[PDB]
Design an enzyme around this catalytic site. Structure first.
Site, short mmCIF file in Angstrom:
data_model
loop_
_atom_site.label_atom_id
_atom_site.label_comp_id
_atom_site.label_asym_id
_atom_site.label_seq_id
_atom_site.Cartn_x
_atom_site.Cartn_y
_atom_site.Cartn_z
N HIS A 1 -5.00 9.90 -0.71
CA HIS A 1 -4.67 8.70 -1.50
C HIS A 1 -5.89 8.01 -2.09
CE1 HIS A 1 -0.41 8.94 -0.53
NE2 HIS A 1 -0.77 9.15 0.72
N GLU B 1 -4.76 3.58 1.60
CA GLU B 1 -3.44 3.56 1.03
C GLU B 1 -2.87 2.14 1.17
OE1 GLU B 1 -0.54 5.82 3.09
OE2 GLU B 1 0.82 5.99 1.36
#
Ligand SMILES: OC[C@H]1O[C@@H](n2cnc3c2N=CNC[C@H]3O)[C@H](O)[C@@H]1O
Ligand SMILES: OC[C@H]1O[C@@H](n2cnc3c2N=CNC[C@H]3O)[C@H](O)[C@@H]1O
Ligand SMILES: *[C@@H]1O[C@H](CO)[C@@H](O)[C@H](O)[C@H]1NC(C)=O
Ligand SMILES: *[C@@H]1O[C@H](CO)[C@@H](O)[C@H](O)[C@H]1NC(C)=O
Ligand SMILES: *[C@@H]1O[C@H](CO)[C@@H](O)[C@H](O)[C@H]1NC(C)=O
Ligand SMILES: *[C@@H]1O[C@H](CO)[C@@H](O)[C@H](O)[C@H]1NC(C)=O
Ligand SMILES: *[C@@H]1O[C@H](CO)[C@@H](O)[C@H](O)[C@H]1NC(C)=O
Ligand SMILES: *[C@H]1O[C@H](CO)[C@@H](O)[C@H](O)[C@H]1NC(C)=O
Ligand SMILES: [Zn+2]
Ligand SMILES: [Zn+2]
Lengths: 482, 482
Positions: free
Chosen positions: B356, B331
């Site tokens: 993510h 991320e």
């Protein structure tokens, strides 16, 4: 064993990224080690403070890039060729204001709308329906209190550079509006014959100074004019480019020269563009050594598509003639529209290179095809940021392409409009921002060599270029190694 | 024949994008046709005006998304499961202020630093180190001139939503600072036992209302407390989650239920995290039906890496036990650093899902490996924008992954903190912004089914879920078709 899987995946990625298979000699390994140390340190600090230039707008980041030891090293680097450039965006505007506006017979004016505009003439031009009155600059400078401020206001009108570009340029249409207005404004200055020659010559000086040895230029070849009011034609401009480049190469024997890619605006009728295609063929016949081919330029989102122009773009093929193409394509944030398919259509028209190809990574099949036909993209990172395709260059879609070693060259596009110079600023963005932390001396070397490989020079001229570049490369290696 | 090459490349891209090989029935083809007409018209208009919600900050774009016929259709869509959510970010803050702060025994306070904070207590607790005086809310609310102004100022402190987020949140550290401060503030409200039950129940209501039927939640399992001042433990929280979910499923027979992924902050010592790993194993033994596994959360750029935690994360393996993992990973905007290699290390630790996976497309080898092991990424578009990983969601790196039909699920992460609700806003962003103009009903359908496929339910529970979802799907199809 799992450790081995992990190490294997890291080595695979080391190998497939751009330049990852280039073999370095021990001298180059040493230069890389010193280069990478300086890179890593700079990135550590940017991770600490979050002051990281590629992630900021170039206008605000420029002064920081200039303080960078990495930038300094990239200034020194023999970068090869600049392959994506425009006729009137390649010379620092400083010289346009300080030198050119101070030359005899320079007149200034303002359109009904208040757009600035210039003309060299004697005597003062007749008030026309685009200029209520022309005013000689030498008179204007006498009547103003602060001359240095008036001059600076001209410099601020000749570039996009500004504080708070997020506020000034609210969207992509506004920025393109200002962009084109600049071209219009500076046009009357540059297209006066003795300025034109000086301009061409100076752009070679600036790129030569940046350690770039060859240039291919997208040129509108607008009429160049004399004090009498006579206009020259396309032939005359191509002759002049050749002549000035010969003069430059005579006093700089390592500089290879320039070629011209003839261009016209994509906002025009297919019939007008058909006329421009014939001109291009004619120019190729007349100057096969100077004119590399043809391109369509302008705001891609708002103008016609390559498909729209099919009739006109097929004219050479129907005449059994090969007109090489160098299409701007997929310079857009849109995906799955008529605009990003321009990449596909550029490829179907046998384009030699793709300008920008920003939307390429969103089209895996076109990506594979272009890689297979070895057709490179010309990536211009500063342009993409300034023109608002992407905020943070860490998010540039070319990062993915570098990670698989896709064929590409780096260029600067219109450095002067963005407050850049030559090619080094764009090499900084690629190397520090787009390529990530693991981009190394191999990445750089590969990008330098690519720019010779994908140029339109003859294969024997490419060898001579490689020879010259290799020697400048060794000198660079030895410097950085100490 | 060149026409055929062109058509072949377009069909190939049609086929390899996400959902591209799903066969639609004639009813679905009809719904798709009406859906795509509405999508295309909306995109045409956004191309005209440049008012395109995914390209704007979600705070400013939300009111425009709510006026969208496409959004409207997506609200109606049975979306399957929400697989990436956090314990205390899933319920509209409106209810926290208007309902919870108005409940008896609510006290407010301000840290030496001025950070707001809450506590339900009877009697009024003694001034401590971090709070020099607790004041009952029912008192406070009388001692102010405008109470609904005072209430609004509480709502403004409970979310990140603001005008001019570009000015308020200058960088990623500033936004993460405010983010975490919100969690700290609302914590005292939510962890009081009868609010906790009501909170859990309401988050099911809000997702059920959004036509989402299953939830997996990343939960810190912080101590829940009573008016007496007694604290409950982790076991008690898991029991309660199970119990409230049972109560909910009893009055909503189509809702599947919830599972818990236990989580701890990545800013902690490996020894503390080792302690948390043992808790997770214990919770799995005690509640194999409720507790799916473990995850590490918090600001990834500034905390420890997965490698840093190797010793602690290997504890289950050394005990010959399988603790499933659901790591947040990559991320980040950084590339080639210790942070984005967390994706590699998540895979090396046999993660079931990747949270993510933002940096995935910059690592081709890891990409291939995760695709081969069928390990999906959990993409949360609004979160990535608000937390400043990407400005214009048209530039989201997942666009590339969709184009090759990579395994992925869509979730909302902490919708309440961003001013979102349930899952539909994030489906809008994916479908209109990240997926591009050619994302269709197949894309949506694939993403809905993926969320059942990649859940941690038993295979027989997945079938029952598919059965229930298919019926809601047909109903949805018939509506949109008329
Ligand atoms: O010759 C100047 C002309 O080139 C065009 N031009 C100049 N710079 C670029 C341009 N075209 C397209 N996209 C952005 C960038 O690559 C512009 O239309 C201008 O009028
Ligand atoms: O349980 C609440 C905790 O979860 C964490 N948390 C909440 N939302 C996200 C989180 N962690 C990491 N990245 C962004 C997003 O996925 C946060 O640290 C908070 O304190
Ligand atoms: C030059 O000044 C004019 C005043 O009309 C302004 O509108 C224009 O944007 C300026 N050009 C720039 C900043 O490039
Ligand atoms: C592209 O190449 C093909 C195959 O040689 C040729 O027939 C066609 O005319 C070319 N198209 C253009 C636009 O040059
Ligand atoms: C507040 O929430 C509770 C439980 O969710 C609900 O039963 C109650 O009616 C709400 N209070 C008011 C005043 O509406
Ligand atoms: C945070 O706390 C105080 C308490 O009302 C308030 O004055 C301030 O405006 C709040 N911040 C925001 C962004 O609402
Ligand atoms: C991952 O799987 C491998 C192969 O079965 C196993 O040896 C290893 O212990 C696992 N790692 C973890 C963290 O569970
Ligand atoms: C500036 O222009 C040229 C550079 O090409 C230089 O030779 C000349 O001396 C200068 N002239 C004026 C008028 O400033
Ligand atoms: Zn260009
Ligand atoms: Zn999360």
């Amino acid at each position: 064993s799992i450790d081995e899987t992990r190490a294997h995946l890291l080595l695979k990625e080391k190998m497939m990224r751009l330049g990852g298979r280039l073999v370095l000699n021990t001298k180059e390994e040493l230069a890389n080690e010193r280069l990478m140390t300086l890179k890593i340190a700079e990135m550590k600090e940017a991770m600490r403070t979050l002051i990281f230039p590629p992630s900021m707008h170039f206008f605000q980041a420029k002064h920081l890039i200039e303080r960078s030891q990495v930038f300094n090293i990239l200034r020194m680097m023999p970068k090869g060729a600049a392959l994506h450039l425009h006729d009137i965006g390649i010379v620092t505007m400083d010289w346009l204001v300080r030198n050119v506006t101070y030359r005899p017979h320079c007149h200034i004016c303002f359109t009904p709308r208040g757009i600035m505009q210039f003309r060299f003439a004697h005597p003062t031009p007749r008030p026309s329906e685009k200029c209520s009155k022309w005013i000689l600059l030498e008179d204007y400078r006498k009547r103003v209190q602060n001359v240095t401020e008036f001059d600076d206001s001209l410099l601020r009108n000749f570039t996009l550079v500004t504080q708070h570009p997020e506020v000034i340029y609210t969207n992509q249409n506004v920025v393109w509006s200002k962009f084109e207005t600049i071209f219009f404004t500076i046009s009357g200055l540059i297209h006066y014959a003795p300025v034109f020659r000086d301009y061409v010559f100076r752009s070679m000086q600036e790129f030569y100074e940046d350690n770039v040895l060859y240039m291919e230029i997208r040129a509108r070849l607008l009429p160049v004019y004399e004090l009498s009011g006579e206009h020259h034609d396309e032939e005359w401009s191509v002759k002049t480019y050749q002549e000035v480049a010969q003069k430059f190469v005579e006093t700089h024997p390592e500089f290879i020269g320039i070629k011209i890619i003839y261009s016209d605006h994509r906002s025009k009728d297919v019939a007008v563009i058909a006329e421009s295609i014939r001109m291009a063929m004619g120019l190729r016949i007349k100057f096969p050594t100077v004119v590399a081919g043809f391109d369509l330029v302008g705001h891609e989102d708002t103008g016609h598509s390559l498909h729209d122009y099919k009739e006109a773009l097929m004219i050479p093929a129907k005449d059994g003639v090969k007109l090489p193409y160098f299409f701007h394509a997929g310079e857009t944030d849109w995906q799955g529209t008529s605009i990003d398919r321009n990449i596909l259509d550029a490829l179907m028209l046998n384009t030699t290179r793709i300008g920008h190809g920003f939307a390429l990574s969103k089209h895996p099949a076109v990506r594979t095809y272009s890689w297979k036909k070895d057709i490179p993209i010309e990536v211009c990172p500063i342009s993409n940021q300034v023109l608002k395709l992407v905020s943070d260059l860490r998010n540039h879609p070319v990062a993915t392409l570098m990670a698989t070693g896709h064929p590409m060259v780096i260029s600067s596009d219109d450095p002067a409009m963005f407050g850049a110079k030559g090619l080094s600023y764009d090499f900084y963005e690629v190397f520090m921002g787009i390529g990530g932390m693991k981009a190394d001396l191999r990445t750089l070397k590969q990008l330098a060599m690519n720019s010779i490989k994908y140029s339109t020079l003859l294969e024997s001229e490419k060898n001579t270029f490689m020879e010259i570049w290799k020697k400048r490369w060794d000198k660079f290696i030895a410097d950085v190694a100490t």
